[PDB]
Design a protein around this ligand. Sequence first.
Ligand SMILES: CCCCCCCCCCCCCCCCCC(=O)OC[C@H](CO[C@@H]1O[C@H](CO[C@H]2O[C@H](CO)[C@H](O)[C@H](O)[C@H]2O)[C@H](O)[C@H](O)[C@H]1O)OC(=O)CCCCCCCCCCCCCCCCC
Ligand code: CLA
Ligand code: CLA
Ligand code: CLA
Ligand SMILES: CCCCCCCCCCCCCCCC(=O)OC[C@H](COP(=O)(O)OC[C@@H](O)CO)OC(=O)CCCCCCCCCCCCCCC
Ligand SMILES: CC1=C(/C=C/C(C)=C/C=C/C(C)=C/C=C/C=C(C)/C=C/C=C(C)/C=C/C2=C(C)CCCC2(C)C)C(C)(C)CCC1
Ligand SMILES: CC1=C(/C=C/C(C)=C/C=C/C(C)=C/C=C/C=C(C)/C=C/C=C(C)/C=C/C2=C(C)CCCC2(C)C)C(C)(C)CCC1
Ligand SMILES: CC1=C(/C=C/C(C)=C/C=C/C(C)=C/C=C/C=C(C)/C=C/C=C(C)/C=C/C2=C(C)CCCC2(C)C)C(C)(C)CCC1
Ligand SMILES: CC/C=C/C/C=C\C/C=C\CCCCCCCC(=O)O
Ligand code: OEX
Ligand SMILES: [Cl-]
Ligand SMILES: [Fe+2]
Lengths: 80, 449, 37, 107, 37, 342, 336
Amino acid sequence: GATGERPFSDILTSIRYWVIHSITIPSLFIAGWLFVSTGLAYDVFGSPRPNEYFTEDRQETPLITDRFNALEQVKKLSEV
Amino acid sequence: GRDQESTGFAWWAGNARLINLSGKLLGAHVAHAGLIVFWAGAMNLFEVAHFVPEKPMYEQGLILLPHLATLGYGVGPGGEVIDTYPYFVSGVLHLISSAVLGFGGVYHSLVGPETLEESFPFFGYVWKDKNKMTTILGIHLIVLGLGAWLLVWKAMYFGGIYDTWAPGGGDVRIITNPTVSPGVIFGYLFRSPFGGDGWIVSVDNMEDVIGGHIWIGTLCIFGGIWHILTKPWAWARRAFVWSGEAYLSYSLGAISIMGFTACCMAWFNTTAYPSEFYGPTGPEASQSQTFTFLVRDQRLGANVASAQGPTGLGKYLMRSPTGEIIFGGETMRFWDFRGPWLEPLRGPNGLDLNKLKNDIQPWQERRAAEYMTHAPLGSLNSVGGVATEINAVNYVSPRSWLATSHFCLGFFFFVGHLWHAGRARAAAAGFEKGIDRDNEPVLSMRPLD
Amino acid sequence: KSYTYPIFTVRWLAVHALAVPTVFFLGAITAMQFIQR
Amino acid sequence: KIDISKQGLNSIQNETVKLNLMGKSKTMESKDWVDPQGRKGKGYGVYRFANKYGANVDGYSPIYTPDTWSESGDSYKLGTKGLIAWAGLIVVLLGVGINLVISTSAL
Amino acid sequence: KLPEAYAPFDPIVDVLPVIPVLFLLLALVWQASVSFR
Amino acid sequence: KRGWFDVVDDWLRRDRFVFVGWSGLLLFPTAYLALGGWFTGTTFVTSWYTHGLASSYLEGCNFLTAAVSTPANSMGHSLLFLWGPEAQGDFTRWCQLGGLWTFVALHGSFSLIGFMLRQFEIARSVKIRPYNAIAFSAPISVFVSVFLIYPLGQSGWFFAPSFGVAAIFRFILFFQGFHNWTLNPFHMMGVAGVLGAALLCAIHGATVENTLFEDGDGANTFRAFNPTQAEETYSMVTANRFWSQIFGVAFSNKRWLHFFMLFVPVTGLWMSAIGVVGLALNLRAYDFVSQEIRAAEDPEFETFYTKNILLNEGIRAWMAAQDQPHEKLVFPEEVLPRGNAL
Amino acid sequence: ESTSLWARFCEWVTSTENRLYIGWFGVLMIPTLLTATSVFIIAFIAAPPVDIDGIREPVSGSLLYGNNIITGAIIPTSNAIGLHFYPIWEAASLDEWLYNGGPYQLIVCHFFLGVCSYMGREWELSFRLGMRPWIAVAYSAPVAAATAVFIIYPLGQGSFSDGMPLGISGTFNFMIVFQAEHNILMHPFHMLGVAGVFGGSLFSAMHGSLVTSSLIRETTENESANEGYKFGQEEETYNIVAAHGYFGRLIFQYASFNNSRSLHFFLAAWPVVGIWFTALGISTMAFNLNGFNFNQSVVDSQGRVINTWADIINRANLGMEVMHERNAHNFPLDLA
Ligand SMILES: CCCCCCCCCCCCCCCCCC(=O)OC[C@H](CO[C@@H]1O[C@H](CO[C@H]2O[C@H](CO)[C@H](O)[C@H](O)[C@H]2O)[C@H](O)[C@H](O)[C@H]1O)OC(=O)CCCCCCCCCCCCCCCCC
Ligand code: CLA
Ligand code: CLA
Ligand code: CLA
Ligand SMILES: CCCCCCCCCCCCCCCC(=O)OC[C@H](COP(=O)(O)OC[C@@H](O)CO)OC(=O)CCCCCCCCCCCCCCC
Ligand SMILES: CC1=C(/C=C/C(C)=C/C=C/C(C)=C/C=C/C=C(C)/C=C/C=C(C)/C=C/C2=C(C)CCCC2(C)C)C(C)(C)CCC1
Ligand SMILES: CC1=C(/C=C/C(C)=C/C=C/C(C)=C/C=C/C=C(C)/C=C/C=C(C)/C=C/C2=C(C)CCCC2(C)C)C(C)(C)CCC1
Ligand SMILES: CC1=C(/C=C/C(C)=C/C=C/C(C)=C/C=C/C=C(C)/C=C/C=C(C)/C=C/C2=C(C)CCCC2(C)C)C(C)(C)CCC1
Ligand SMILES: CC/C=C/C/C=C\C/C=C\CCCCCCCC(=O)O
Ligand code: OEX
Ligand SMILES: [Cl-]
Ligand SMILES: [Fe+2]
């Protein structure tokens, strides 16, 4: 039978449900759009922008060679 | 409509609720025909509006326009599009007629008579009434024969059809002497499907096409008249299952065979599918590549006839397994190719060395180069070239699209024929809903070894 | 009879933990389509 | 074994849909019933052992029971004023969102 | 291209061929509205 | 129930829409973190500094070409913690160094452990036998041998599969070119098991659906069933006779039928896992010495095995330069093996 | 009582009391399959080398010519012949017939006819026994796959030499060359087929384990439950309700199958549709409609190329492309 929760068919056909969720879902969509468009995605996760793939120093692909100085090596390779 | 309560058929099998409703079935069929005409007109309008004259037809992803070009509409000598108005006229006519067909279908499906066996006895029928079904079959056979004769009249009196083998380049000819010889017609029909023979796909002139269409029109009209005036014999009543689903399965098998044949004809033929509007075929591109490389290396001072390849067989010219002089390399498998730009250089015993050493024409060279570069290879996202190429060319051959789509359709309709033939044979016998617990057939047989 | 159900349950958290980030990521990916190289 | 009346399918307006959800059909139990293709019925109905086991699989595990639906939720408590406030809020939020999307982009 | 007199109606032509797929989807929608009886 | 353990067990093993159980504490957090790590890596994190590629939607990749990439070969077999001696607490540089792959793998293994534990717990709560929990051992062994044991026997995590579609395709092609994985008898047993399992599934479904019993008057036969009924819904005698006269042999035991159905794919996957474990140490069934010697002495002897050897050689030579940037292989165009005119 | 010779023959042919059903499709099936089996065994044991590429470079595939089971195969027909019909009576001698690859064509044709007749005979016995006739529809998926790899691909590529060899290492070579030329791994239809086989294995194991976990106790601990089941019994031997409860608590209630008929239909439908789509993909790729080509797709601001896993796959394809036939090519493009 039922485990003690409101049926999904009852919830999904509710004026209250569609009044609450006419704000939350578009708000999350706009939040994601603003996260991408404001440049936060590049800075938080360290992805290269199209103009930052190759710098004036090196014109080849990056290569990390040291395991314990890996932090400093990747800091040097990411320099703009 | 109806419901599972009073029918026993679920919503995913709802079209089976109108098996015994003649009026609603007729409405559904008319609406579907309207849909087909609508697609034809809309696609013609879409293709005519996106056509540029600086590129050939096969380079722009068109599949309906080359059908009108082969009928001699808006094309000129050599296979160059001159006028694009008849395509617009055809598309407009199809789109407008689709409205009438759709209105008829909607009327007959919604508010028309539900079962037209009491008010319209001429149009009413019963699936188990063999005479009425045979009469309808004869009427539609007469209609199809009239359509074939209508095609025949175009190539004779109403301007003719495009002939890619016409002297002095391809042009819209008029067919005056069709081949109606029984030996010629029976030769194509009862030919082997293997290489060299090719069954009916190997028809290589428009005279044979027009003669065969005369034959098929006469046969269809005579068969329709024969079926209107007769009823199935005892040997036919003893062999078939007589129900609507059975008739559907028969038609499904027939049109699956038709779809496979259409796929093969699109892939292989060059007469009814001129390379000027569909691009080169499979073998045509390989032959063109070998021809153009031979021409280039000959221009650099080389002996093409006596040149020896890495395997010792011949770089440019070798011998077919029967003796004919053919192009060398891996294109030795495509020596059955026969195209308008290559035939003039071919003698009785194969390619003529002197002809291709002194009498090769610039138009032939240009055709070979163009068909070499536009080979029927591509990817799903429309990237031309082999699978190990880069993203530079947006091209997939119109032959590839038609061949792949129609093979898929033919296979799926063969599967549908299997499903419906099995279901009809089971339902007529009376055990399509399961085994009877009270009387199980297996329990009454002696056990096996 | 009258049926009364709780609003916040374990199922609520299970649904939302997968629904909220999905919509956020879908919005981000949609924004990603209009970036010019 | 199964009581059809206690399966929570009694609050459905459409009689045909209600009969469909319980796995029942009064038409099919008649001995003269003929389906679309033209096959006679043996009087079994939708399910042969409907009396022995109470009901069908449809009447055993339904997935649409309006009886168990909450008494609330079919009427919005906040009324017309709540809907007006929601309309104002959604218009304001849509304007703010489109302004932010336009401003943060490259026009 | 379309004749010069039919140029303004080009956007209408560009969306025509999807109507049969829309028809199949409309049949599904009608069945859903009927509630799959 | 008065003790802390008793009340906690009462709440955890409750009847709910989503069963939590005692194993939920291990399953749900780790599984959620693994899924989130994969989605974040495929959406935002790149692979430029560890592999030299682009593996994110942000950089212009679709669902097929986006992946979470393995660390560089310099890192060896480091577990690459966020607080380890390589990232040193920097989240952005941890993501750039390839630490999300180890994050996802280490959380996914514990999620698999938690899922088998959940299967055991639910089976014991309902008072049935744990054969479904036994059947998960094959997927768990495949995951353990492919993603952990094989990289642990190689240079580093760099040669592990990357969590993506095209990355897995590259892994498969690498296994063909370097290991001759198609010629491994254990892989042959695995292929046989998978294909036989598909055969069994299709044939059992068709045979059951086409030997039904007439329990209703409607053409829709799905509505003539009741789960609490006693009689079987299809004719085992009829099915057995049909398959005895068509094939030659047929099942006469439902329990044996379903145990065979369970047994085939599990054994296939376990055999493939043993093969990959063996391959982790480059113990590859790569060549036949007699065939190589005969082809060397006689320049006329050729079989399909030699052609496959040549294909593997070409794959290795042409993929080595870009697939392994750490080796710094610079190959002049005249040393790469090549055919005539191709 | 039957009296006519034809009536008695028909009664014997359509008899349900035979140890193996013959039928009218079996009349076609038995001789073609026996012919193909005999030729296959004899060629696999003692056949001479076959010139497969038509470049006078014979390839050995027989056990008697220095091969094992893994290496032995039946070499496809010569490239010189192409799609031409090459029956045994079109050769000057059996020595010439065996040198060009006749047995491959013979076996392929007879096998195609035999499998079609096998599916027909499946339908026939289903009809004679009083069953529902769709086990034959299930068999259409492997039949289509075999047809695609043995007939349609040579049909579209212009030669039987591009067909799949009747061996193991030959099969691997076919797969590798197919990947190098069509990028099959990137084809959505191949992805659907892989999903079909993986899901088939998943669901087979799932169903077997769930049924084995709900067996009702009818034996002791010193004997197997298979002895607990009795052939021809009327009562069900396992608890469908218990299995459904376990699965619905494993994932959630409305994910399991409460209907045995629906569950078995799903089991039948998944792998069949998967294999249908993968066979359609092979047949489509026969006419040179390859998979997705995401090569040099990611480009940075200044125009340079940023590589991807697709580009690594492309490098592997280039590696296995320039070597699939060393001496069979004289011109830069493999247009066939
Ligand atoms: C009466 C019952 C049948 C009796 C005979 C049965 C024989 C069975 C033998 C056993 C093997 C199976 C059949 C093999 C067929 C091979 C077809 C082939 O090599 O080629 C096919 C031929 C194409 O012929 C080609 O025709 C060409 C035409 O030539 C000319 O074509 C043009 C003419 O102007 C151009 O000039 C061109 O340059 C020139 O070459 C060439 O001759 C080629 O060499 C020649 O190969 O097509 C055709 O015959 C037309 C279409 C044929 C049918 C459909 C084929 C595809 C479908 C296969 C079956 C179904 C699969 C799906 C379902 C699976 C589950 C059940
Ligand atoms: C539910 C269980 C769970 C489990 C089993 C794991 C498992 C793992 N995590 Mg994950 N994680 C979880 C939930 C979980 N995580 C949660 C909720 C978060 C928050 C988002 C994270 C965030 C996270 C991060 C940020 C990282 C991991 C990583 C890892 C690894 C940690 C390595 C380590 O040294 O542990 C610690 C070692 C232990 C043995 C702990 C047990 C010690 C016992 C309990 C003794 C207690 C005694 C102590 C002296 C007294 C304390 C009591 C007092 C303070 C009250 C391991 C594979 C790492 C990774 O994957 O690297 C690649 C890493 O970078 N996890
Ligand atoms: C190829 C198109 C197609 C066509 C022509 C039909 C035709 C038909 N269907 Mg089938 N059907 C289809 C696909 C199609 N179906 C599909 C894909 C499904 C699966 C969802 C079904 C499932 C199905 C069921 C379950 C049932 C039918 C039934 C019917 C018949 C009765 C119509 C009716 O009562 O309801 C029509 C209902 C409405 C009032 C909706 C009207 C909408 C109109 C028709 C849209 C078309 C208008 C267009 C936009 C403009 C045209 C006007 C013109 C001037 C241009 C009708 C002949 C019924 C039957 O069996 O009859 C006994 C029924 O029970 N069908
Ligand atoms: C639309 C397609 C069509 C269809 C579906 C039918 C359907 C039918 N026909 Mg009709 N028929 C047609 C067109 C069609 N016919 C035409 C065009 C003609 C003129 C030739 C005839 C002449 C005709 C005759 C003379 C007879 C039928 C009969 C029948 C029934 C027997 C089924 C059968 O074929 O046995 C299954 C098929 C076979 C066992 C083998 C047939 C294959 C032939 C022999 C292949 C070679 C073709 C042949 C030699 C013709 C020459 C080729 C051409 C180039 C000249 C069936 C109702 C029979 C009947 O019941 O009449 C009332 C019958 O005796 N038909
Ligand atoms: C004209 C006919 C056309 C088709 C002919 C088909 C011929 C093949 C038949 C094989 C039967 C062998 C079964 C052995 C075992 C046996 O006796 O099976 C009989 C077994 C009996 O089942 P029961 O229900 O009676 O068992 C009761 C339990 O108590 C058992 O413990 O049934 C099955 O398991 C069916 C599965 C067969 C799966 C066989 C697949 C093919 C095997 C691989 C072939 C390799 C060939 C190598 C060549 C070099
Ligand atoms: C019954 C039914 C159904 C079906 C239906 C159908 C199928 C229908 C169809 C219909 C149709 C099929 C229709 C059509 C229409 C059409 C139209 C309406 C047209 C129009 C046109 C126009 C308007 C044009 C114009 C133009 C011109 C003139 C020139 C150029 C330009 C242009 C193009 C603009 C369904 C499924 C729902 C289900 C239920 C039942
Ligand atoms: C136009 C044209 C042409 C012509 C054509 C023609 C003239 C055709 C014809 C055709 C035909 C004329 C066909 C026919 C067909 C037939 C068929 C396909 C049949 C089938 C049959 C069946 C399937 C049967 C079955 C059975 C049996 C065997 C046993 C008992 C039962 C039954 C009866 C069911 C040509 C090529 C010159 C050229 C191009 C164009
Ligand atoms: C990393 C990390 C972390 C974590 C995080 C997380 C947990 C996240 C999550 C996330 C998530 C949770 C996400 C999600 C996403 C999703 C998505 C993105 C989806 C998509 C979808 C789609 C695209 C769909 C599609 C489709 C359609 C539409 C149709 C049909 C089919 C399908 C369904 C496929 C933490 C901070 C703790 C720590 C550190 C590290
Ligand atoms: C090539 C070796 C094979 C031979 C098999 C050939 C034929 C089989 C033998 C007899 C055919 C059936 C004859 C009639 C049997 C009795 C039928 C009856 O009375 O019902
Ligand atoms: O033969 Mn088998 O593989 Ca069909 O592509 Mn061209 O030819 Mn050869 O190369 Mn690639
Ligand atoms: Cl070549
Ligand atoms: Fe089962």
